[PDB]
Structures are given as C-alpha cells and as structure tokens.
Amino acid sequence: NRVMLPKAAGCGGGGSMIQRTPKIQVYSRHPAENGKSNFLNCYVSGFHPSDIEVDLLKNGERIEKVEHSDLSFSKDWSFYLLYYTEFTPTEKDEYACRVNHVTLSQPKIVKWDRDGSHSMRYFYTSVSRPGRGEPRFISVGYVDDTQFVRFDSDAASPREEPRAPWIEQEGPEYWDRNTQICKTNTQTDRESLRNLRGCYNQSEAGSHTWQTMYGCDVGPDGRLLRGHNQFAYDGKDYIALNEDLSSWTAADTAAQITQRKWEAARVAEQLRTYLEGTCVEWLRRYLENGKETLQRADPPKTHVTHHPISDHEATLRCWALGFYPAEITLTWQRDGEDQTQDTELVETRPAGDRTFQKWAAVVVPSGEEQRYTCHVQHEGLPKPLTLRWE
Ligand SMILES: [Cl-]
C-alpha cells in the first residue's frame, strides 16, 4: 500500500545528465528443444533514459504480438524491460533481438545463440515529453522480486492494476485509495519536474526524468529492518532519506533547497510514520496472503559448460537457472581461491516465469579445467553448491 510523496522545491548550476546504453540478452525461458513450445526472451537492462525500442526477429522478420514487462529500474536508477514471445524453436529457424536507444547511432542486433527477510518497494518513473502532452508516469510495486501492482498514466483508464494473484483479494477501497495516491503523485511529479527544470536553468524544450523509490525491509519475525525513500533526477541521486528516517542527504545545492523545504514541512516524520506503520503492516499482510509463492525459495539448477577459444585457453561457464528470489552469488575459484580478476558476470535475468537466470565465465589454460570450481550462494540452498567441469 502506497504513500503520498512530497514535491521537489522550486528555486544553482546547469545540471548534468547520465546516459547508459542498454545491455542486451537474448535467451529462452527453458533449455530449448526443437518441437517443444517455449518462450523467447530479450532482456534489456542498465539503460538511461527510458525511451527504448525493442523488436524480436524471426528469420530477420520482426515478430508481431511480442509482450513486455512494466518499466522498472535497478538501485543505480537504470531501467530494465523484458520482451518475450511464445515460440517453438527448430534447428535452422533464426531468432534475434533488435534494440534502438538514444545512445546508439544505428539499431543494435544480437542473435539467439543457443550455444528469511523480505522487502516491499514501489518504483516511480516520470518523464517529461515537451511538445507531446503531459509527462509519462509509470509506477510498479514489488514484494521481493515479485511485481504485484502497476499504474500507467497512458493506460486507457489509469488505475492501480493487480499483477499478482494474491493481491486480487483486496477490496475496492484498496484499489480506490491506491489509484488516488497514484493520480495525485502523477501531478506532484509534474510539479517536481517543473521546479527542477527551473533550478538548473533548463529549457522547457528538453525531456527530463524524475524517479522515486520507497519501501521497507522486514526480518523473518516481521520487524522493520530498515526503510528507504530516494529520489533521482536525470539518472543520478538527487535527495535521499537517511537510514535514521529523520534526516536527508542532498546531492547538490538545488537539492539542499528541497531539503530545507521538506525539513520545514516535516516530510521525514510523515515518511517515518508510513515506513514503520503502513509499509511493514501491509508487507506482512502480503507475505501471508501470498505465502505459497512469496515465502518459497527456488534453488538454482546448476551446470558448467566448456567453450574452447584457442589451443592454450578455454572458457568455463557456470550456469544457474530457475531460481527465486533473484539474489545470487556465482564465483569461480582456482584451487579454492576466488578469481575476482578474470571472471565475466552477466546481469541476473528473468526467465519470465517468476524465476531468474545467471551465468559466470572464466578463461582457463586448457588442460587445467579441473583446478577450477564454481561456487553458488543462494537463499534456497542450505549452504553453497560447488561444481566442477565434468
Ligand atoms: Cl538493483
């Protein structure tokens, strides 16, 4: 259940804008077997700003009826989206993903090369679109790595919408209240965007991004472990509530003006009341109503593959599949010693069925594959797994 958020203050500097080009992964939900129905995924992550174009291709032809996830972002404020389609692969039918973004000068194509504690978070993204109407407002709510609501200001009838089966039982006063909070926050974000543009002497002709996150973490007993509330402008920290839930950290002079305004208005006190009360209380409720899924950890299915590169070298890839929640640690060791330097780690990616996937790769002198073991830490495993190349 949401909280009404404060407005950034109107007012030095000209600002600064972070741009991040998308990381792209194309993969199937399950290990692909010709003739068996499956899902083809294109996961784009780590990008900023949020406008992006993603197509799935089948033998170079764009696939129609591709669906995608609701816009959300990671702790560094960068965005991620999953695009996916049901399909049946063959041995020569070809699939790929084509991505365009402001950071690219031509569309980028990557082919399908088949070779305890809990948290609640709400994420908000507002993006102005000068000359093209009001800002786009999208907000999603998560319990751990399970999305349970979305609000999109561009929907035909913008409303808080259920996205997990255990939230559907909430009554109409719940949907009414949270829809109202979203609609109000839409307008608050519009004012924040206006005030921020003024603070940095920025033109009304340019697009800017205002992101908000808040939420709470609880232990196994249900007590509040900590609360969060952070804001970002154009992809960088702007102001954040400190862990004491009583003071702010402001990134620059303009944010200090917001800090002084929110101190005078006792915003931190209102957020503390929410985080210690409503937030933890509803999270505890959701965990009980969704216990069959939210409180079941799925351990990873793991295996190691061998990929020869040269005579004197080869790549070992350690795979983890079908795990929930997304938090996982994969580490390669040589004679038990972590190979921090030479390991390649991809971003953890959704399979599309609530579970997640990840791999870790290390380059090895051929003939010495046996001195290397992969080391998997996950909440669903009583203690770490170790695997060797067999
Ligand atoms: Cl993250």
Numbering used by the authors: 323 to 333, 996 to 1099, 2001 to 2275
What text comes from the article?
The α1 and α2 domains of the heavy chain form the peptide-binding groove, which is characterized by six pockets designated A-F. In general, two well-conserved primary anchor residues occupy the B and F pockets and are located at position two and the C terminus of the peptide, respectively. Upon identifying a peptide that binds to both HLA-B∗39:06 and B∗39:01, we determined the respective X-ray structures of the two allotypes presenting this peptide to 1.7 Å resolution.
For elucidation of the crystal structures of HLA-B∗39:06 and B∗39:01, the peptide selected was NRVMLPKAA, which represents amino acids 320 to 328 of human NACHT, LRR, and PYD domains-containing protein 2 (NLRP2). To enhance protein stability, a substitution was made at position 84 of the MHC heavy chain (Y84C), which leads to the formation of a disulfide bond between Cys84 and an additional cysteine introduced at the second position of the linker connecting the peptide and β2m. This analysis suggests that the covalently tethered 9-mer peptide NRVMLPKAA binds to HLA-B∗39:06 analogous to an 8mer, with Ala8 occupying the F pocket. Additionally, our HLA-B∗39:06 structure suggests that for 8-mer peptides presented by this HLA-B allotype, the residues that are solvent-exposed and likely available to participate in interactions with a cognate T cell receptor (TCR) are at positions four and seven (Met4 and Lys7). Consistent with this behavior, we found that Val3 of the peptide forms van der Waals contacts with multiple residues of the MHC heavy chain, in addition to a hydrogen bond with Tyr99.
